[PDB]
Scaffold this active site. Structure first.
Site, PDB file in Angstrom:
ATOM      1  N   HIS A  33       0.846  -1.192   0.000  1.00  0.00           N
ATOM      2  CA  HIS A  33       0.000   0.000   0.000  1.00  0.00           C
ATOM      3  C   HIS A  33       0.888   1.251   0.000  1.00  0.00           C
ATOM      4  CE1 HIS A  33      -2.002   3.173   2.541  1.00  0.00           C
ATOM      5  NE2 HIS A  33      -2.841   3.079   1.524  1.00  0.00           N
ATOM      6  N   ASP A  34       0.538   2.228  -0.842  1.00  0.00           N
ATOM      7  CA  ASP A  34       1.297   3.476  -0.986  1.00  0.00           C
ATOM      8  C   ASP A  34       2.778   3.119  -1.051  1.00  0.00           C
ATOM      9  OD1 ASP A  34       1.230   6.345  -1.171  1.00  0.00           O
ATOM     10  OD2 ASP A  34      -0.316   6.348   0.390  1.00  0.00           O
TER      11      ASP A  34
ATOM     12  N   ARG B  33       0.464   6.275  -6.354  1.00  0.00           N
ATOM     13  CA  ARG B  33      -0.381   7.469  -6.323  1.00  0.00           C
ATOM     14  C   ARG B  33       0.453   8.613  -6.884  1.00  0.00           C
ATOM     15  NH1 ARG B  33      -3.883   6.494  -2.224  1.00  0.00           N
ATOM     16  NH2 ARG B  33      -4.361   4.255  -2.034  1.00  0.00           N
TER      17      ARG B  33
ATOM     18  N   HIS C 235       1.484  11.860  -1.709  1.00  0.00           N
ATOM     19  CA  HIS C 235       0.637  11.380  -0.631  1.00  0.00           C
ATOM     20  C   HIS C 235      -0.055  12.690  -0.306  1.00  0.00           C
ATOM     21  CE1 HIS C 235      -1.187   9.730   2.829  1.00  0.00           C
ATOM     22  NE2 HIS C 235      -0.583  10.569   3.651  1.00  0.00           N
TER      23      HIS C 235
ATOM     24  N   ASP D 288       0.832  -2.732   4.480  1.00  0.00           N
ATOM     25  CA  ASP D 288       1.760  -1.662   4.804  1.00  0.00           C
ATOM     26  C   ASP D 288       2.985  -2.351   5.370  1.00  0.00           C
ATOM     27  OD1 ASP D 288       0.416   0.633   4.122  1.00  0.00           O
ATOM     28  OD2 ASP D 288      -0.383   0.983   6.139  1.00  0.00           O
TER      29      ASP D 288
END
Ligand SMILES: [Zn+2]
Ligand SMILES: [Zn+2]
Ligand SMILES: [Zn+2]
Ligand SMILES: [Zn+2]
Length: 296
Positions: free
Chosen positions: A32-33, A69, A82, A274
């Protein structure tokens, strides 16, 4: 020449899986991210850091799905963000690391989720979608076919998962309505049913239960080849040391990993987590990869 123990080579674990298996069926670890590993400022970290290591570390540990992102710049490039914060990582940086990984490990595939994270900068010549397609997607590294994508066709390529609208080029998984902070079901490439658990801002107990509920569903629907399950174990920051993505991951990662280890299921879905690392045992991404044993 395919054995179940070959799933233990974290840099080449997809090698033993048959070419005809849809990616949707494979249990795949994701991050994630993914590009937040360069954040240094303690205030930026507590709020937005979700990974401690770079892209190659993530891939070498088994991650094959990456949550990218980005933001369109005046240079007609896309950089990672972010919220309004530039992560000091670019889209090209990710793709180049993915290209290297795929060159070194041609048996694997890299699934790249791409979402618009922040408003376009003024001065860009086109749109987020048109710029991505013209300056990045044209690259042969990107799979250009769709449908219920099979591993065989994805090997050595990057498979796009669109989370942006306006696409004008074929390839990967089409964009679809993604309700905010919920577990929802919809359809994608005409014949793929999708179920997503992305409650990124619910209370801790609700989060843990939601991950488990969706995984329980996945485990009891293992033969549904055209169903795509995306399960985010990540949880958004509360702004403090006791409710940061790191604190949450420290308990959630081992908890869910244990669920898989104890149940020993044949499918657990695409588990996006994460902080992929080797600090907490059992390791979530490893148990996720091991759930592909029956496919061999
Ligand atoms: Zn510029
Ligand atoms: Zn880098
Ligand atoms: Zn289904
Ligand atoms: Zn390690």
């Amino acid at each position: 020449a395919s054995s179940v123990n070959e799933l233990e080579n974290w840099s080449k674990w997809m090698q033993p899986i048959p070419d005809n298996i849809p990616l949707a069926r494979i249990s795949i670890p994701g991050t994630h991210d993914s590009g937040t590993f360069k954040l240094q400022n303690p205030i930026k970290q507590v709020w937005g850091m979700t990974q401690e290591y770079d892209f190659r570390y993530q891939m070498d540990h088994g991650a094959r799905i990456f949550d990218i992102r980005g933001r369109l710049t005046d240079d007609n490039t896309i950089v990672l963000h972010h919220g309004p914060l530039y992560l000091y990582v670019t889209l090209h940086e990710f793709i180049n690391e993915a290209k290297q990984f795929l060159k070194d490990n041609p048996s694997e595939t890299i699934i790249m989720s791409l979402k618009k994270e922040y408003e376009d900068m003024k001065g860009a010549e086109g749109s987020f979608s048109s710029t991505f397609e013209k300056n990045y997607f044209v690259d042969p590294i990107f799979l250009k076919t769709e449908g219920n994508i099979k591993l065989g066709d994805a090997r050595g390529k990057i498979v796009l998962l669109k989370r942006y609208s306006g696409s004008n080029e074929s390839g990967g998984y089409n964009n679809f309505y993604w309700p905010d902070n919920e577990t929802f079901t919809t359809t994608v490439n005409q014949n793929v049913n999708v179920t997503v658990q992305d409650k990124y801002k619910v209370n801790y107990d609700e989060k843990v239960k939601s991950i488990k509920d969706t995984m329980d569903e996945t485990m009891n629907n293992s033969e549904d080849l055209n169903h795509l399950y995306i399960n985010f174990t990540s949880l958004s920051s509360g702004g403090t040391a006791w409710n940061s993505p790191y604190s949450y991951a420290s308990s959630i990662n081992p908890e869910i990993a244990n669920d898989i280890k104890q149940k020993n299921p044949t499918r657990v879905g695409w588990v996006i987590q994460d902080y992929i690392n080797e600090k907490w045992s059992p390791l979530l991404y490893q148990e996720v990869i091991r759930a592909n044993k029956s496919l061999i």
